[PDB]
Design a protein around this ligand. Structure first.
Ligand SMILES: NC(=O)C1=CN([C@@H]2O[C@H](COP(=O)(O)OP(=O)(O)OC[C@H]3O[C@@H](n4cnc5c(N)ncnc54)[C@H](OP(=O)(O)O)[C@@H]3O)[C@@H](O)[C@H]2O)C=CC1
Ligand code: SF4
Ligand code: SF4
Ligand code: SF4
Ligand code: SF4
Ligand code: SF4
Ligand SMILES: [Zn+2]
Lengths: 57, 144, 198, 193, 92, 161, 118, 340, 189, 112, 126, 172
């Protein structure tokens, strides 16, 4: 039911993940609690660099 | 339920007799009247009024008065308490509720100078009705 | 009852000091017998059952208390006999029934202990039977039967910060305390219970 | 929302027959109406389109085909309202079609003649869920109820009816304010010959 | 027509104030079933005793009840103690 | 001049929020057993996109299914507070609605609405899987519609002022 | 036999089937059915109020099972989700309307069920 | 008079009890509205709240629905706020009418500030004079409500208070001074600014303005006592703290309670006002907030006081300590403190 | 507080409370309550015994409980599809059961000494046979992934090894007693 | 105890791993086939068919004119209220109206 | 093979045993109803208002539920409501022994044992 | 000993040292234990009211020794001071001073110890635990107090004050 035959579930999931708010618990270091997701995301997108799609491509 | 057979076996149309009209104090249902003579005996011996008797014979005997009239003898509340079946009931309390939903507390009246003991049955914040209590030292088991 | 059944008179034989009173009825199965026992020789009876041949192969099936304070025969009052559990319960204030199953004899035994002391204190079989820990904890939490020298006295099912014995003849159905959400406290608070009545 | 009927489903005699019969609008709308499977569009058998078993009072069309691969998927209904993929709800069905669609009874609602259900005078049209809507059922004593005061007064008057005291100016026979009683009953003994 | 709470009215409607418009009951009982049943006509029955169940078969309506159509006064109809239907004598 | 784009943005946000109404993996009693049966293959809540999330910090739909007692009300309030915003609440079963059979029990919360705010309620005890699905669909429709309920008034230029 | 939405049935003439026998109230295992009855203006045995607290109603159908005149019934309506806990407290008029909406299928079910022992 | 303010109630009840008070509350979607609704319903009172707050899925509306028990609270949806018929229907059978609708700190337009306050007060008070069932009428005004105040919100509050007093002779004009609470806008504002900066708190003046903060629970208790007092009808009441404190003193008290070192970076008031006026305003940034910080908000004593209602408010330091336990600075603590 | 709840209500008034006790197995508890009521009444349900419907309902409840336990254990161990398969089987079983009472998991059809003889269809028996074939197929499919999987074996082999004396001390019964080597079962006694 | 009978999981079919289970499966298949053949022998099946006349206000014991008048009073035109049929079915004890399902049960397609 | 028989239609006869062995009770049940028998009406009223009276006594009946022996111990003082009703659920016994069985196991093994203990929280809670 | 109050159930001060490099030690009298309380054995039977009183005094002292940690952990120190909480608990205990049954006293002591351990384990909500520690006849020190009753019912007797308030709802 996500669009026509549920063809856009992933886009809706990403948009909803953006939509929901996040609150850092007062019992933890906000600096580290925020830096961990940002560092993980920066490391996550870097996987595209070490990838070959063909001969010398 | 206790001393009965358990099932019924008389598969025929039942006899019917119309109810009477005796005022707003005695609710009459002659169909369930088993002609137990309780009303006649109580009126003749306890209340002292002479208006109840057995009319007819066979399976069509009428448990009621011959002529159409009301029973006003200051003990009309004892007629309902005297009928062994649903022949006589409290018309003001008719269809009010069942005994399963009434809470009864024993107290004493103040309406009469005797203050005969009674039991007041109530349901929640609303008082449902009152019934006589057996007090041989005040009023036996009858009330006004 | 077409199976072989016999009273466990060995209990009174070993005890040699307690007048044995046993009862067998067709309301229960053919292998169920109920006997009244004094609380004095209760731990002794439990140990003797726990460590005796032809009886060591036993396991505690259930344990429950009966508030014999207000248990009254509603109907057929004249039908009471002179050796009736109903009369025995009417005589006492509480009756603790412990039902065990003996696989060696393949039978069911029900020890009924009559409690009349105001403290409702009895010995604990938790140190004898392992399952008796949680059972006795629940029994104490519900009926107030004080298991002396018990393995654990911690609460079992009663609500936190609540001191009551709901499984008692005095306790009404609705209780007394009800929990709402206190906005002035931004948390759950507890106040008096004002319940709707039928 | 595009391609309600795929090429594979459109490459069948059933699709051509339905399009020639019911038109392009109806052919496309069925996929948006009651989409259950791309291979089940208009039925599972490819020889033709399943006939319309009946029509609901709310415009819904109920059909049934035994060629479905699932036993619990025998009868289906297509609703008229298809604003969104999740716009329609299971409360739009009529009472007559509810028993047939739920396999409660094989009897189905009939428009005229012999009817599988009785037609009494007190029948009222079935409506969808009024919850979270202005047509929601209103209890007698609710705060938003515009006449909860009357219901409260009636309930109180059952055992706690207040005494109608005087309101305003009136005659006073001494310290006793003179006001007439309002008892509906009439004392005949006081006025009789 | 007669004013409520009269002695004649009390004698007639079994010491009750009958409501003609039936809106008073439709509000008190929260249902217009009183007027809906009042829309029914009076039925004449030949037998002096009738068996009423409110339906067509046993357990398909209310329990069977025997009503006596032969009373002291001729032509006095009786409403069912189980259903809203009323039956009267065929002739008198 | 900010409502023109916001309205399409509001519609897209409503569609996205309806598409990922993840129920909380928090069930207690027979009503929760029925809800779990509603997660089975036969009852495809995945068709509507309902995927159970274990953590309240990552959940959006609170499926209160079971009986609430005096020993669980503070935990329920703490979970409701810990639920990430925006949040919706659906109480399935009579016990979660109003106690049900234990409405007169001393160890009953006597209603889940007195503990946490509830958006939707289900009547059955236990409600059918179809009943739970219908309730979820109604809640999703309400959430999609509630985003732009026409609270703002339209100016003379047909613009929400 | 699906015990769906509680509803008040009626005779084919439309008259109230409830005979104020209090059997439903004495049979509701949680006492979820509340009745307040007084003699009708015509004298019928009908209640002034008939309430069913769906918050405390198990929808068990015991009232229908013990119904004396086939008044209380359990219609097939299962989509009774309520957005208000106050709205969930159905009453006499609401039950009458619910029975009016789904009387036909209820009538067919009643006929089939009666035909089971018949 | 012609409208009896007598409303006899049994306050000894609970959430599920009956007190006899029927109330209509307008503008309760803020911080005080939920508190007032919980306070009234705590003794078992009937509450009706007309609301049209955007993004209705916000916890404010659902929590306001939880102010009273089930069957005792009603939330009227999409009230027009300009319909006299709707206003009359809202308090048709309510003996209390409480108007807390007022310009938000983020609200900046002079027209909207004048429109909302003045028009809402006039219409609500006029409707209150058309329904005789109303026994009490309360208007939640600002303590610093004055005609010459540079704060347009304060000027509109003073004008609305005058209009409400004119339309309904027996109104109760509340003047709270920076009520402190959980969802408040002073302690929460300071905490939010400090956490967003993590270095200091932005100030636009010398922080010399005097303030008398009060507890939200104290305000609710005072409101209940005033509703229980007949002489409070047609009276203006002021709610200030037991002791007066400056803005710098408030910052120092907050720092002492929390342990975070108070660092305040000062900025030019003129440039700050120009920037906050030349842009869109939010809850954490408002020209109205700047003007209020450049304004004195103290209990002027020109009318009745909380002492007239006979409620002794608790210490603002005690309230702040109760409210900010978890935001403490993680200093060196004993080994026993590590096990919290 | 189900104990006091039942104790403050009539005998029939506390009937559904047994279903809520054992949520997975609502028929075994109802059957036990009916048997206990009959024993207190000193009689036996002749119609229920002669119809064998009590045995069929107990077997269906046992099968449903076993399927649910297998689903939960597989989910806990890490198998996510056996839960779905057992849930489909339980849905079929509940559909069959609801034909006798109208509820999926709380039927409460068994009365103390009375049986609703009208609600008995031979089509129910035929569908029960078909469901038995389907359940045999489903059990084979489930055993194809859990019986011989090395991961499942190493996750269950010698785990929680109890014995006869261990079971006797704490009174472990049922499947636990059967696994402990104890041949105790009230059905065959 | 001196001669145990051990059921060992050896085959991919748990039913095949027990001779009694295989026999039960064969019996179920045979019974299903026999029932199917017995039903196929008739080629038609009776089924419960409700009638609007079943929801009639009065029973057969009532008079014919009275029954028609009662049916007209409720504005009933769907149930059969014919006086001739009412007189003909006076005091009848028929079972019910029944329908006949005709084999084979196949989907009714609208194909052109 | 018959042509108009349910036996011809279905080989299963759910009423055959009861009809052959208890024909008197079968006929009594299939013939008389509360809508037709006044005694049956009284029975329906008593069963729906006060319930059948139970003789005073204490009994304990156990049934082999799938989780083990589920027992009910009912003591009735003669009234329509039992004086006491205790429930011995095998789930409680399984919960009481998990710590004795959980000792020495890892976290995954503990979860697996909790799954294999066959404990239903409703049965334990009562 | 192998008990929740045992000396060995103390959290080490350091990750490698109990208290210090020269001696050991830990805090468990005023703080929580290292591990959970597996078992809570029943109190030994005291046949003398003197022993019962000694046990009651020991329980009161133990409760007082944890009043600071209980208040600090629950963030409920604003409601009353530690001495104020101790005084309120003493008044509450004095309310039950009429007891004379050693078995009842032992059962009450066991229940109180269990409740305190539950509070020590933070298993119970703070808003509910405040019921025992709240002031008997004074307003909570975490919120403002209104003397409306003291002013209006100034020198009014208890009977008059009760008559002026009303024991039930005035509307129904
Ligand atoms: N906070 C303080 O310390 C002080 C506060 N006050 C005043 O006290 C009053 C009550 O406080 P509080 O509960 O926190 O409320 P808020 O100031 O936080 O919020 C304003 C309230 O009124 C509504 N509202 C705002 N603007 C309008 C408008 N134009 N038309 C209609 N309704 C509107 C809001 O609803 P919605 O969600 O729809 O916007 C909300 O319910 C406020 O009006 C405030 O000015 C006075 C002195 C000090
Ligand atoms: S008391 Fe009743 S039963 Fe007896 S004769 Fe009179 S009417 Fe008949
Ligand atoms: S209640 Fe009694 S008097 Fe009335 S009809 Fe029944 S058996 Fe007869
Ligand atoms: S409402 Fe019914 S099904 Fe749901 S948990 Fe309660 S008793 Fe069980
Ligand atoms: S059993 Fe039927 S007729 Fe009797 S009171 Fe209940 S609903 Fe009314
Ligand atoms: S369905 Fe069951 S719980 Fe609901 S009102 Fe009827 S008897 Fe009571
Ligand atoms: Zn009738």
């Amino acid at each position: 039911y996500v669009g026509y035959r549920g063809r856009l579930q992933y886009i809706a999931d990403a948009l909803k993940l953006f939509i929901k708010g996040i609150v850092v618990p007062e019992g933890s270091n906000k600096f580290w609690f925020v830096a961990i997701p940002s560092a993980a995301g920066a490391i996550c997108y870097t996987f595209w660099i070490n990838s070959m799609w063909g001969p010398s491509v | 339920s206790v001393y009965g057979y358990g099932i019924s076996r008389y598969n025929e149309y039942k006899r019917a007799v119309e109810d009477k009209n005796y005022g707003p104090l005695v609710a009459t249902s002659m169909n369930r009247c088993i002609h137990c003579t309780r009303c006649v005996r109580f009126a003749t011996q306890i209340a002292g009024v002479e208006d109840l008797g057995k009319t007819g014979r066979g399976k069509a005997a009428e448990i009621g008065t011959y002529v159409e009239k009301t029973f006003n003898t200051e003990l009309s509340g004892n007629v309902v308490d005297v009928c062994p079946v649903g022949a006589l009931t409290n018309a003001p309390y008719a269809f009010t509720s069942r005994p399963w939903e009434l809470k009864s507390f024993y107290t004493s009246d103040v309406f009469d100078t005797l203050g005969s003991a009674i039991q007041v049955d109530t349901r929640g914040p609303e008082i449902m009705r009152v019934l006589p209590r057996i007090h041989e030292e005040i009023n036996e088991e009858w009330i006004s | 009852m077409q199976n072989k059944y016999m009273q466990p008179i060995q209990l009174f034989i070993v005890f040699e000091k307690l007048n044995s009173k046993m009862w067998i009825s067709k309301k229960l199965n053919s292998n169920h017998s109920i006997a009244l026992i004094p609380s004095n020789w209760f731990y002794s009876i439990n140990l003797f059952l726990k460590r005796e041949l032809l009886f060591s192969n036993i396991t505690l099936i259930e344990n429950s208390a009966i508030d014999t304070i207000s248990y009254n025969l509603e109907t057929n009052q004249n039908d009471l006999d002179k050796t009736n559990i109903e009369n025995y319960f009417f005589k006492n204030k509480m009756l603790v029934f412990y039902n065990y199953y003996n696989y060696f004899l393949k039978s069911k035994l029900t020890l009924f202990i009559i409690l009349n002391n105001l403290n409702k204190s009895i010995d604990s079989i938790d140190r004898i039977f392992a399952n008796a820990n949680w059972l006795e904890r629940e029994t104490s939490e519900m009926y107030g039967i004080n298991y002396k020298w018990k393995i654990d006295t911690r609460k079992l099912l009663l609500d936190y910060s609540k001191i009551e014995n709901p499984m008692l003849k005095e306790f009404q159905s609705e209780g007394t305390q009800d929990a709402f959400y206190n906005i002035f406290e931004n948390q759950v608070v507890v106040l008096k219970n004002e319940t709707v009545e039928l | 929302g595009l391609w309600s009927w795929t090429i594979n489903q459109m490459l069948t005699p059933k699709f051509w027959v339905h399009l020639r019969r019911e038109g392009f609008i109806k052919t496309w709308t069925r996929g948006h109406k009651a989409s259950r499977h791309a291979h089940y569009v208009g039925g599972n058998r490819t020889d033709g389109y399943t006939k319309q078993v009946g029509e609901d009072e709310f415009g819904n069309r109920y059909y049934e085909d035994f060629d479905v691969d699932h036993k619990n998927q025998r009868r289906w209904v297509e609703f008229s309202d298809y604003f969104m993929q999740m716009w329609s709800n299971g409360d739009k069905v009529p009472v007559g079609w509810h028993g047939w669609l739920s396999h409660q009874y094989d009897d189905f609602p009939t428009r005229t003649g012999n009817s599988a259900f009785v037609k009494h005078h007190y029948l009222k049209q079935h409506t969808a869920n009024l919850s979270n809507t202005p047509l929601n059922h209103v209890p007698q004593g609710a705060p938003q109820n515009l006449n909860r005061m009357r219901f409260i007064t009636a309930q109180r008057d059952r055992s706690r009816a207040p005494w109608q005291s005087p309101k305003g100016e009136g005659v006073f026979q001494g310290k006793k304010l003179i006001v007439a009683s309002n008892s509906p009953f009439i004392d005949d003994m006081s006025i009789r010959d | 027509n007669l004013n409520p709470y009269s002695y004649e009215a009390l004698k007639e409607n079994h010491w009750l104030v009958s409501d003609s418009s039936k809106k008073n009951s439709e509000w008190t009982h929260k249902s217009n079933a009183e007027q809906l049943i009042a829309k029914v006509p009076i039925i004449y029955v030949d037998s002096n005793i009738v068996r009423c169940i409110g339906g067509t078969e046993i357990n398909a309506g209310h329990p069977q009840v025997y009503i006596q159509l032969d009373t002291r006064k001729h032509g006095t109809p009786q409403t069912c103690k189980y259903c809203g239907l009323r039956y009267a004598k065929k002739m008198d | 001049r900010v409502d023109y784009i916001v309205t399409p943005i509001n519609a897209v946000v409503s569609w996205a929020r309806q598409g990922s109404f993840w129920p909380l993996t928090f069930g207690l009693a027979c009503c929760a057993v029925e809800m779990m049966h509603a997660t089975v293959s036969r009852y495809d809540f995945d068709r509507f996109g309902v995927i159970f999330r274990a953590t309240p910090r990552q959940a959006d739909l609170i499926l209160v299914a079971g009986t609430l007692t005096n020993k669980m009300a503070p935990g329920l309030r703490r979970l409701y507070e810990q639920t990430l915003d925006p949040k919706w609440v659906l109480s399935m079963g009579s016990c979660a609605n109003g106690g049900g059979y234990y409405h007169y029990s001393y160890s009953v919360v006597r209603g889940c609405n007195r503990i946490i705010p509830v958006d939707i309620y289900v009547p059955g005890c236990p409600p059918t899987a179809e009943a739970l699905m219908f309730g979820v669909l109604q809640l999703q429709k309400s959430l999609y519609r509630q985003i732009n309920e026409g609270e703002k008034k339209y100016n003379k230029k047909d613009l929400t002022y | 036999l699906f015990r769906g939405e509680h509803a008040l049935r009626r005779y084919p003439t439309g008259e109230e089937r409830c005979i104020a026998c209090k059997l439903c109230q004495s049979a509701c295992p949680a006492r979820a059915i509340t009745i307040e009855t007084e003699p009708r203006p015509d004298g019928s045995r009908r209640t002034v109020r008939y309430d069913i607290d769906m918050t405390k109603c198990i929808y068990c159908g015991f009232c229908q099972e013990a119904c004396p005149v086939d008044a209380i019934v359990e219609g097939p309506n299962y989509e009774q989700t309520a957005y208000l806990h106050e709205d969930l407290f159905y009453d006499k008029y609401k039950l009458l309307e619910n029975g009016d909406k789904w009387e036909p299928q209820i009538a067919r079910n009643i006929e089939y069920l009666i035909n089971q022992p018949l | 008079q012609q409208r009896s303010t007598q409303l006899k109630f049994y306050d000894g009840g609970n959430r599920q009890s009956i007190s006899g008070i029927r109330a209509t509350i307008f503008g309760a979607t803020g911080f005080m509205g939920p508190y007032i609704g919980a306070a009234l319903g705590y003794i078992g009172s009937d509450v009706i709240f007309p609301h049209n707050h955007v993004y209705a899925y916000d916890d404010y509306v659902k929590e306001l629905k939880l102010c009273a028990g089930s069957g005792q609270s009603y939330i009227m949806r999409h009230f027009n706020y300009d319909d006299d018929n709707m206003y009359d229907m809202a308090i048709k059978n309510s003996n209390v009418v409480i108007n807390l609708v007022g310009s938000r700190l983020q609200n900046k337009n002079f027209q909207k500030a004048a429109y909302a306050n003045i028009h809402v007060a006039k219409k609500i008070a006029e409707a209150c004079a058309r329904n005789p069932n109303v026994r009490r009428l309360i208007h939640f005004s600002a303590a610093g409500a004055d005609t010459k105040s540079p704060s347009p919100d304060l000027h509109t509050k003073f004008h609305g208070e005058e209009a409400v007093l004119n339309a309904f002779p027996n109104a109760t004009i509340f003047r709270p001074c920076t009520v402190y609470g959980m969802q408040d806008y002073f302690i929460r504002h300071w905490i939010k600014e400090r956490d967003w900066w993590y270095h200091f708190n932005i100030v636009t003046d010398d922080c010399t303005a005097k303030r008398q903060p009060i507890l939200i629970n104290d305000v609710a208790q005072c409101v209940l006592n005033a509703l229980k007092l007949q002489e409070s009808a047609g009276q203006i009441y002021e709610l200030g703290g037991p002791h007066v404190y400056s803005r710098l003193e408030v910052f120092e008290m907050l720092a002492n309670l929390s342990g975070r070192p108070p660092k305040l970076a000062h900025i030019p008031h003129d440039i700050a006002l120009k920037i906050t006026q030349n842009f869109y305003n939010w809850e954490f940034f408002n020209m109205e907030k700047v003007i209020k910080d450049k304004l004195d908000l103290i209990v002027t004593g020109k009318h009745k006081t909380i002492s007239d209602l006979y409620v002794q408010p608790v210490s603002f330091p005690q309230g702040a300590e109760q409210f900010i336990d978890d935001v403490r600075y993680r200093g060196v603590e004993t080994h026993d403190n590590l096990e919290k | 507080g189900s104990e006091k709840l039942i104790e403050d209500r009539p005998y029939l008034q506390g009937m559904p409370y047994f279903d809520r006790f054992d949520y997975v197995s609502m028929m075994v508890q109802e059957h036990a309550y009916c048997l206990g009521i009959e024993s207190l009444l000193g009689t036996t349900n002749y119609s229920a015994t002669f119809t064998q419907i009590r045995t069929m309902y107990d077997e269906l409840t046992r099968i449903l409980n076993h399927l649910l336990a297998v689903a939960c254990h597989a989910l806990d161990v890490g198998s996510m599809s056996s839960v779905f398969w057992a849930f489909e089987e339980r849905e079929k079983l509940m559909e069959f059961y609801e034909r006798v009472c109208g509820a999926r998991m709380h039927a409460a059809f068994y009365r103390p000494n009375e049986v609703n003889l009208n609600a008995v269809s031979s089509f129910l028996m035929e569908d029960i046979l078909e469901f038995s074939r389907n359940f045999f197929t489903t059990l084979n499919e489930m055993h194809n992934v859990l019986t011989y999987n090395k991961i499942w074996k190493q996750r269950l082999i010698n785990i929680g090894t109890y014995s006869f004396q261990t079971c006797l001390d704490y009174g472990l019964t049922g499947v636990m007693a059967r696994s402990c080597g104890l041949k105790r079962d009230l059905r065959l006694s | 105890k001196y001669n145990p009978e051990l059921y060992i999981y050896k085959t991919y079919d748990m039913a095949a791993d027990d001779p009694v289970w295989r026999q039960v499966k064969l019996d179920l298949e045979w019974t299903f086939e026999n029932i199917a053949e017995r039903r196929e022998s008739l080629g038609y099946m009776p089924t419960f068919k409700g009638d609007p006349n079943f929801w009639q206000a009065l029973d057969n014991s009532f008079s014919p004119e009275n029954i028609a008048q009662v049916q007209s009073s409720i504005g009933d035109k769907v149930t059969n209220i014919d006086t001739k049929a009412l007189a003909l079915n006076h005091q009848t004890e028929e079972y019910h109206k029944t329908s006949k399902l005709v084999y084979p049960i196949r989907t009714n397609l609208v194909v052109e | 093979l018959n042509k108009e028989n349910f036996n011809r239609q279905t080989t299963v006869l759910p009423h055959l045993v009861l009809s052959y062995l208890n024909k008197n009770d079968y006929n009594l049940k299939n013939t008389k109803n509360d809508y037709n028998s006044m005694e049956e009406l009284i029975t329906h009223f008593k069963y729906w208002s006060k319930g059948l009276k139970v003789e005073s006594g204490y009994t304990y009946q156990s049934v082999e539920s799938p989780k083990g022996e589920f027992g009910v111990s009912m003591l009735s003082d003669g009234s329509n409501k039992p004086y006491k009703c205790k429930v011995r659920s095998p789930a409680l016994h399984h919960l009481q022994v998990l710590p004795k069985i959980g000792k020495g196991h890892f976290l995954a093994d503990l979860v697996a044992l909790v799954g294999t203990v066959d404990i239903v929280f409703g049965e334990i809670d009562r | 000993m192998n008990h929740y109050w045992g000396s060995s159930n103390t959290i080490p001060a350091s990750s490698t040292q109990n208290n210090n490099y020269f001696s050991g030690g830990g805090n468990n009298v005023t703080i929580r234990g290292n591990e959970i309380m597996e078992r809570l054995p029943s109190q030994t039977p005291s046949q003398n009211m003197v022993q019962a009183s000694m046990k009651t005094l020991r329980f009161y002292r133990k409760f007082c020794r944890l009043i600071p940690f209980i208040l600090r952990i629950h963030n409920i120190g604003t409601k009353f001071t530690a001495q104020q909480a101790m005084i309120n608990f003493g008044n509450y205990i004095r309310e039950r001073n009429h007891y004379r049954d050693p078995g009842l006293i032992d059962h009450r002591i066991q229940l109180g110890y269990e409740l305190l351990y539950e509070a020590e384990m933070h298993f119970s909500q703070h808003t509910i635990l405040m019921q025992y520690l709240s002031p008997y006849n004074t307003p909570l020190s975490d919120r403002g107090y209104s003397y409306l009753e003291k002013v209006k019912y100034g020198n009014k007797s208890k009977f008059l004050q009760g008559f002026y308030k009303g024991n039930k709802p005035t509307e129904f």
